[PDB]
């Protein structure tokens, strides 16, 4: 441990660089490994950014939020994580190294504290100073090595074990005479000379990789999961979409597609029904029927109610004497379909709150000739009435308890970013134009179970317009949704652009470019 | 030798990145074991395990208080096993050592095959078993697998409930790991009750009427209500709430219909502010509201009783006493069910309108027994479940007067809740320590009279009886403090008389 | 940079009968001192004190928390300052040492006649402070007369260009001879270093001046600068003060006898006595209202624009006869000693009130010009019984009130009682308070709370103070101020009275 | 100390002198035993009496004159039979049993009233005559 003190170019303040060992490294003997695998000399040499290594304070940030929490692990530096893929396991602390772009005419302290495994991190500065810690100054703060040990009861890591953190958090407040003033921190790391790893396996792990590539495919190029033959023509933002609450387009990085969602949407699109008895009290052309269910014969409460993928457009609550879904309908025979042609079609009978505006198996037809038990093609393809885009873009309610996609809301300042396609009208029943909006496209998060997301972190993502003149950022979440930073109905992104990775970011991350 | 049936192996703490050495007093004292209680008695059954304690800092109260400032630990204890018998406790008992991953057998013949000591019950000294910590590993975190101490009945008490508890103290070898700020998840070893009498604490089944009594009653072998529900690990477990007095207002939606043999009848629906989208694993009635039974088929001869008005402009219109029950007073899942539809006795009310309901008494031939089971619940809602105290034991209800209103005539009834939130409130800040029942003794006349309870995390008291009795009274003006933790079937000393 | 202003005389521990040692890692790191954080502006005056602590255990975090497991204690402590300065600002503070028996001061002259530093903020920055350990004994046992440390304002705080504020925390280690004596349970007295709340939201909580109405909002408003209510009053120290009550919803409803005759002019307003059950000698030192019952206000010699209104019926047998609604008040019209007075006598506009007869009173609305702003003035104290003082925040803050709307009753009969739609605030409920009986506060300080919405993505900060009240720092001024009540509360750190919380509400949006 | 209610032999705590000052005096705060029921009798009253010496190490620092104003450890009752014994309800007539009654639950009576510390409490007098 040292300090050292360097004058500014002008000499009005300082900078400090300070190197510290807030808790004592306790160093292995890897009695215990079969073979200790030395690393490359020079990657003790290289301090990279870390993942989630990037935050911004401004006065507005309380004494409170956790800036940074980073658990103590080979995912710290971008070389011992591409080289942990080729290991069962792993010894030794790091060199974190926070940067801070400090001010000698500012105000403001950091505190950085190192955490056991096994111990929850505390919602306050006050709190932190019982840990092994150090506090910085913004007037002269600019470079502080942490050595943080890898803290352990064993004498070498598999994967899968509870790790020791660094955390930091604003122990006093930044204060400045502008009000736009923001100190800039930065955690970089490298591997202490210390640092192992144990035994060469195949480089074959569920753990992620360091750097996403992604395929340079434009939005054009992918499937609109929520209306499969129309092409995605606009990424767009409404910030009266304050929720999602749809179960087709749903897809997460840990469980894969999730609700009612599936990876061949085109596929998936067309139903079958076995016409009931029956038909809605008031308007007998109206004819139950049952959707089919192949993936749930005996009609299980823990597995969907609505065949894989099918339709999940809205109608609104009580709503049938003002509009309707629209589908191809025909009657099952040898080898297909017979008199197939437009029909208007709904979830529910239009007044029981549990079926009405519900996905479940009961619909009605707007067909008066429905034969009992016969079956029926069902293809839906638009909607009528007094139909627009906020009535499809909320879906009929989930129910019971089948393992449905829940509703998400992005962070508070944040919005959506949803793939969009305009679906036409058809004329004789006559179908309304209208745009149908998906949260994700399965094409964009197929890339991304091919490299995996680090554990709770982020994706911030560059999408790339016209080779560069123009670069809008986006978070994408690994619960699904993507997400943009705006200021200020409907906004209209073009969707022959590119999405490019950029980097690891937490949750509570702000996107620095604003729509 | 007999008292170290297994040695203590010493950890080096060489991955230790600072070992943290105690004062060396905590090593020279012996404290009880937190929740190292239990009882034994002839009724014990074979094979049963009396208790089953990790080997842990948990064992000790300087360890326990000590190492919610610490992130790890290492080293056994010497734990001393005290046996309240006398003279004619013919029988056996079996202590023993059980190492991290093996199942711990039903059997005493068993538990001779782990090292163990084997005591008398009629034995006046303390038998001294050192308690090893069994580790692969060089210190414990937080969340780790832990050998045990499991006592077991050896020979059975052939030939009087025999209290026996453990002291403690860490073993020399015994060190703390790393510093860290004092706050833990875990339960505190003692809770500290404030000294609050019955009389302060809401009823959350009539929340305007004072508790004035606590009460026994051996008829009242069950509990089915859906308020005053209240676990310490679940929060608010029926349609219970922390505050009843802001949740025992409802309103309803009146609807066109009437009950199929009365057209005054009127029925309406309650207003669900908590499950808009009406989901049928989310509650059918609105949260905190009453529960108070009116009996099966019974709508002719007693009824609930509200004061009920129309909504109105900022208020309500004409609020004034009527009759009230749940369902139709015919239908096995509506009649005296706890769900979403229930009638008003004022033919008047208009189709779509809203109207207050503030549950205020009973009439006709309601009595204390009718308010006391409550309606039915049925669905996929996660309802509270029945529950009966353990044999022998008798539950201990906070007992509320609900005065009647005259002219809708309403009939003066009590009022029992199975537990106050203002008592649990307390119990939710400290934790209980898993396995682990409060044993409370409640404190009257300045320590003139102690009654013994024991608080269930399952949300209730008991108290043990000897007798019957159909409505035992204790006052309300004393105030509980922690005794001690015991396990779920320790038999408490103090005996309750019900005969008098 | 280390000052002993005093020296630390040693203690041989002779007399003990056990020495217990620390660990010795606590004497190695500097936490933060539990209560030692405070805030000097250029608003903060001279000679004020900023920050007044007993040199004891409770001064470091670990030393504290040990100390619920032991009898008495010797030894000093090594303070560190940690000063968040900034280039442009002049001023001294001064740190006083007091001896055990000694009173504190209230000025800077005299101050300066003690062992103390005078601490510039160009260089008082990770300054070092002996805090020794005063006595004429072996050690300490509990509740002994203890040396203090006093941090007062030298020189103002002055600023060349923009006008910032210094925030300053102290961090503490024991010094090497700091030592504890004798085992006890860990019970004991000493408040813990550490709060820690259980996460029940606002709403989940009873509101104690309006029992049946569910908290909605917490509120704030620049004018209500004044609490006299009796309501809603609770204190870490004493519990429950000036006829406030644990459980507000069943101590709501009183009775009443009717009383002879009617106020003067106003022959419908007859006088009533409140039955007093808890003091039926009529004790001029026990309160003269049942415990619990309203104290909303309705004016001064108001009764011809507004009165109270509750359901009332006359006792029997078979409970209550004839419930309905009528308008009552506090005393008589006009004398000013009953007029808007907390006491006994009450009117109740019934013709019907029988002689000697009891009457059922359940307050449940306010009438004709009452609003928000009449509800908020409680009736005045009163005579030689124990009531709530009135309070005030401090300069620069203001209440955050628990708020509920009382619902309006209406009645269509032709002079029919008729209410008017209204909001009741309470001062605390006593369903917050609840945990901080077991924990303690330290002594002389007060808890920074975070309020937190949104998941975390919003956080308020407020004090809550001992004597029983939330505050907010504010900019603006308004009416109306809206929080929403379905945020929890999470303890962030204990600070001194005059600290000013960083967090500042915008309090016109 | 835990001690069971069976044993025959006595239990020998020490109770130290717990002090941070020289000596006492009379009138300091001083430490205490506790006696409690550490497990409940749940099977005929048990008398329990305490013996003692001073440690080899207790001193008694400075010569006063032997007078004091606590309690003597023993009380010294003389030899007069309750006849000749005056009754402050009757003072004429010469005490002629000790009496016992099942019924007198209370006494409410302002004659024949001394306390040890307060003296003669109600309308009580030392001289009844």
Known sequence: ENSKTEQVTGATGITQSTVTAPLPEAVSSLSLAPTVNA???????????????????????????????????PELNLYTSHLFRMYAGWSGGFSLKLLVAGNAFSAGKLIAAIIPPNIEVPNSAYLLTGFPHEILDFRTADSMEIIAPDIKNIDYHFRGDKLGKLVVMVYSPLRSTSADFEIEIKLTSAPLPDFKFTMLVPPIQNNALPIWSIPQAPPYSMV???????????????????????????????????????????????????????????????????????????????????????????????????????????????????????????????????????????????????EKDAQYLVIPMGVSGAANDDTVQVAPNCYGSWDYAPTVAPPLGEQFVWFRSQLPASKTVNSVPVNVNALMSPDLIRSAYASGFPLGKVALLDYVLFGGSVVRQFKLYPEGYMTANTTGTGFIIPADGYFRFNSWVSPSFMISSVV
């Open 39 to 73: 690393l490359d000399p020079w990657v003790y040499l290289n301090q990279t950014e870390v993942p989630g290594g990037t935050f911004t304070v401004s006065s507005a940030t309380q004494p409170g939020s956790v800036l940074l929490e980073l658990e103590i692990s």
């Open 224 to 370: 609109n999961p929520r209306s499969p033959l129309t092409p995605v023509v606009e990424l767009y933002i409404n910030s009266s979409y304050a929720t999602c609450n749809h179960q087709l387009g749903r897809y997460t990085i840990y469980q894969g597609a999730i609700g009612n969602s599936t990876f061949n949407p085109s596929g998936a699109w067309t139903a079958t029904c076995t016409a009931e008895a029956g038909s809605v009290t008031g308007n007998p052309n109206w004819r139950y029927a049952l959707l089919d269910l192949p993936d749930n014969p005996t009609f299980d409460p823990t597995l969907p109610p609505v065949p894989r993928g099918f339709c999940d457009w809205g109608s609104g609550v009580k709503s049938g004497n003002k509009q309707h879904l629209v589908c191809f309908t025909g009657k099952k025979f040898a080898g297909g379909f017979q008199d197939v042609d437009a029909h208007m079609w709904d979830y529910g009978d239009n007044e029981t709150v549990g079926l009405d505006n519900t996905y479940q198996r009961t619909i009605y037809i707007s067909d008066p000739s429905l």
